[PDB]
Ligand binder design. Sequence first.
Ligand SMILES: [Mg+2]
Ligand SMILES: [Mg+2]
Ligand SMILES: [Mg+2]
Ligand SMILES: [Mg+2]
Lengths: 339, 339, 339, 339
Amino acid sequence: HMLGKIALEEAFALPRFEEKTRWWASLFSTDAETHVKEITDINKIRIEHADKHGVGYQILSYTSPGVQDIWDPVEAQALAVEINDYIAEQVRVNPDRFGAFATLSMHNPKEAADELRRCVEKYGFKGALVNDTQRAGPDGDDMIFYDNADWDIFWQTCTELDVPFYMHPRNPTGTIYEKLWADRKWLVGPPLSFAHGVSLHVLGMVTNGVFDRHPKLQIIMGHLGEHVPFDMWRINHWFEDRKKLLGLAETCKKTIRDYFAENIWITTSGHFSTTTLNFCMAEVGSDRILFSIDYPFETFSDACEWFDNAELNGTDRLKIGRENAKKLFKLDSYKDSSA
Amino acid sequence: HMLGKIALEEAFALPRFEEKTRWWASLFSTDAETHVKEITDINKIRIEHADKHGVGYQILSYTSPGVQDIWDPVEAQALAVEINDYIAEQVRVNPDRFGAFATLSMHNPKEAADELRRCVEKYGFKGALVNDTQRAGPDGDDMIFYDNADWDIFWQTCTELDVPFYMHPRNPTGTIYEKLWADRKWLVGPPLSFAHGVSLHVLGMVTNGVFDRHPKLQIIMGHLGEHVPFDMWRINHWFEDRKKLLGLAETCKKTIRDYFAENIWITTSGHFSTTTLNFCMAEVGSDRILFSIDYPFETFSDACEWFDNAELNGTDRLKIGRENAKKLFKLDSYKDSSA
Amino acid sequence: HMLGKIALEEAFALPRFEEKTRWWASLFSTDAETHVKEITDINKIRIEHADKHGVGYQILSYTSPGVQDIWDPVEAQALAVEINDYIAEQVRVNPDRFGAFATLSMHNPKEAADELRRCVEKYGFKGALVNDTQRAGPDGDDMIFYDNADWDIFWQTCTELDVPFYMHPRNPTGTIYEKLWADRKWLVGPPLSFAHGVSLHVLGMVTNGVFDRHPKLQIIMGHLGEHVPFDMWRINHWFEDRKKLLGLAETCKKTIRDYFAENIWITTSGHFSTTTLNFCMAEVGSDRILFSIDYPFETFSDACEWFDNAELNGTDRLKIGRENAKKLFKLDSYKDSSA
Amino acid sequence: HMLGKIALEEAFALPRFEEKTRWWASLFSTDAETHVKEITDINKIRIEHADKHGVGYQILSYTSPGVQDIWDPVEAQALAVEINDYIAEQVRVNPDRFGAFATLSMHNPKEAADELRRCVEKYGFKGALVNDTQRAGPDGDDMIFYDNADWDIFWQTCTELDVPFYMHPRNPTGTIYEKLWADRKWLVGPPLSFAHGVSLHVLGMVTNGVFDRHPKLQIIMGHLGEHVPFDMWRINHWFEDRKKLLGLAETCKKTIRDYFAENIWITTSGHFSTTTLNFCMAEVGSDRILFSIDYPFETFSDACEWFDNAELNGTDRLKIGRENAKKLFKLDSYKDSSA
Ligand SMILES: [Mg+2]
Ligand SMILES: [Mg+2]
Ligand SMILES: [Mg+2]
Ligand SMILES: [Mg+2]
């Protein structure tokens, strides 16, 4: 089985947030004590897992909801900077095993662009990972989406640095939580709510022309694309045969399949299904699919024993396991990168 | 090609609602004049389409948002009764070509159960079709969901009559529309918002124990299951391996795959994709998949030329085209029912 | 996991043929001593495997090449009678776990029909399993095929008794072996030669009208159909669009898809691929697919751990695992038959 | 819709072989007069079809059985030289639309190697296309296979020139025809016999170590791989878990999946099935699949309207339609090569 795999939806948390970490674990972990140790650890447990399961390189990112949960913009910016400085220091212990995505406050486009630039230019971070919309407003009940002209300066910064942006989910909050989710709360997270948020935001970027103004922008979705490949036919039909005759073409110049060929990537995080992977290879193409785990919400063992033992042609196993990410992130050599 | 097909997501509108019909058409039709004529027509244009394309029998239902848009419970109930009386007269003209689903006000469980009972016992309707949540509250900004114990009397009526309930989508309205959809409005409807509503409601029924209290209950989703089959693996994993260790097992006794084998059906309405159909046959099983069109939002030609010519084994073409629905709806003979 | 599974490509050998068993094992086993014990054991080792792996019922058959390797018709007939008497006594130990297929000499249609009748009427055997063509001629270099009018009396007996016929492979021999296989001998058996023989014979039955004269006849192929589902499109095209315009229609009245819907079954024996299973469900239909193992050439563990853990909807897992065979073979209760 | 497609299983015949052409047409064409005109035409009808259906570039090859039907080696060699000189002259008329594969007598490895070299060095031919084994012996009843060390000089010539070898089928002849096919003659050709021959030959090359001695060698199969992808799991299992423990590893050093990633290509010729293409994308990988037609045995319309309209992600449509072939055959510029 395959050595030198790359995973890039792999979360950490600051040690000082044990209470928040235990809260998130109460929703999404069956072993909270192990979860606290694993999500705070960078350089021991994570390496032991990766050595056992053929993972050469991991791009680390901050746990959800992370900075997007913080609606005080001053507090949010300070936390992002703290997190980026912290993980940059941590990955220096084992730089041949780890990279990092930038953690950002997304209250303000220029501020986020400047901090992403700092992360990339100063620390060699590989892109940004953001947990869907930024909570905003007096009690955090507002949502900042990034699919509009105010964010052009930010998306042009991604394309100038040529680094991708990973749109990770976050939990529903406030008014949205109360109206839709509170009475069916077991659906919060991976079962449904996570994908509803991310697919809304990315298809918002599609239909509001973000990839037309920034066609080099690379956007990554985890969880095999948050339902979007299932409706590729249906979205394409209702765009090209319906809404684009009614006004959508004014802000959306290409097909949904064009944007998946040129701009959008999907990851295998938390979706260890060969049948669904095969369907995504049909609807999206193996060139656009990246291995990932969703650790420590998922185990290395679940993800890697699935992928290593999945029935897959050798060409696509290599691409999805590491070679797609090697090219996308312009990776230097790392442990087992050519094994 | 295949004769005697059954379609059952096929909408009509009352002639007296032309203004509302034209509004809905301005969002979802590219030929509004034909749409207006086709959605009100039952027994001429609709028959001509079905004769050209091998559709023997259609179960008709009221257009979306229909009665679920009406937040005055007295007006809503009167409209539902009016619609059911109206369509019973229309389908009496060609009983070998048409059946009907009940149209319901869902403000009150017992009231809805009594009108469903009247439709089945008086008119021989085949079940109910409801456009997601019932608008309620002073300005219609509240939502009535049916995934709780207050609706036990209604679901027990469905199982006592042994008729299915079709959970059809409706548009986002009010605060939900303003917060999530207004800034990305081209995603309203088939592109995304429709599936988000229906999947939320049906998975709410799953996780709140509706199919445990009412194990005979049959629920149908259009559009190949509103994303749910894509995440069957992911939902199953996050139910059985995560949330069911945290409390979900107290209100959810079977697996998501169990509920799709025993309670839930999907339809091909508006999703004319053989690649996606094949994937749904893996994840749901051809026994649980029904042909449908979504007329007049989709054309007979699009739906029927796809299905009649799709590469499919002969066994499943027959089941999905008509034999599954013949059994589910206990259909007597109809035009070309054994052709 | 699933209990009460049925397997029906499960071989035994007579104890007195140890030399032949060891020769066949030298080609197709990596542990010949265990293979010899397992292929000769009926009522102990097989039960231990079946108890561990959720197999309720096994229909046993004689090992390849079996009687089809015997070109002396007197010797062949006596061996078939001997084998059938033997296994009837053996399966008698555990009728709640075992049935049997008839073993036949196929030198003479009437003789084969009479022995099949004896097996069904005297012993309650479930059908016939035959290893492709019957060796005949001076050195056994001739081949007897069954896709012609001389065999009408035999196929009419199958439909009168209403039992299926399993077309199992055998090794290439004589002139064919020397010319095609000796210089690439590692392809003999499962890698290639087995499927070439069975597909030739069954498609011979198709194109020579066997299923037109005997429309109730049920034919089973192992190994997910011996390549035939892969070319369902290509065969259908070259039948309906080419050869049926050149003369094939005179002896072949239905499409290849008709014959797979009405006459032909495939088995999962020795082909534990969910990806290939999904493709066969598209091309053949889950109603026409039966679980089987190919023991002791395959292990219970490989077949059952694959099938029990494969990603599959619950409807088709139940059908393929046991319910298709329960109906096809008109099975009374057996261990875990309704578990 | 897609322009600039490349097809490379596209046959021509010499005008002086009209009688042979009409015999072959009597087996495989329903319109012999059009077939005769189309198979002999190079620069008018073939261009008109390609202009209508978005085919920018075609690599032409000699009809089957071609030179492999000629068992006199002097006559065979003279015919190969004649064919290669002829087509080189014909394709100079439209060099932006046509290339050619070498036609070879395969009686002698050095002779075939020298004529292949002449074709590539003198005429810029793109590789070789050979119709399975070379008929040999006094009345042509012997078969020359190429999967042995005597052919090392030929395969080394292929890798030194860095051009692929297309293993095309031919009809069964002589004793093999009489014993296997004469009594089920409608299966000769595309329905079954063609794939049996090619898969035997290519898997012979695999198991006799040709790709271990010549790891750069590229071998192409038409018709979506002549059944081999269907059994990728089964072949791999019976190699790695069985025959490679018995001696096969001594002459076969990699897995069947390795050889499909490094040495073997498949084509869509005569197999216009999206369901089967998707399955082949899973089992072989879209990087290893090339569009082709099988003209004039198949029509441009069937092949191109299937492919142009098949549900496919944009990445793989571009690769399979032309970009895979552009890279493999180093086709920098031709008509619509960048449309
Ligand atoms: Mg995550
Ligand atoms: Mg509808
Ligand atoms: Mg067997
Ligand atoms: Mg050809």
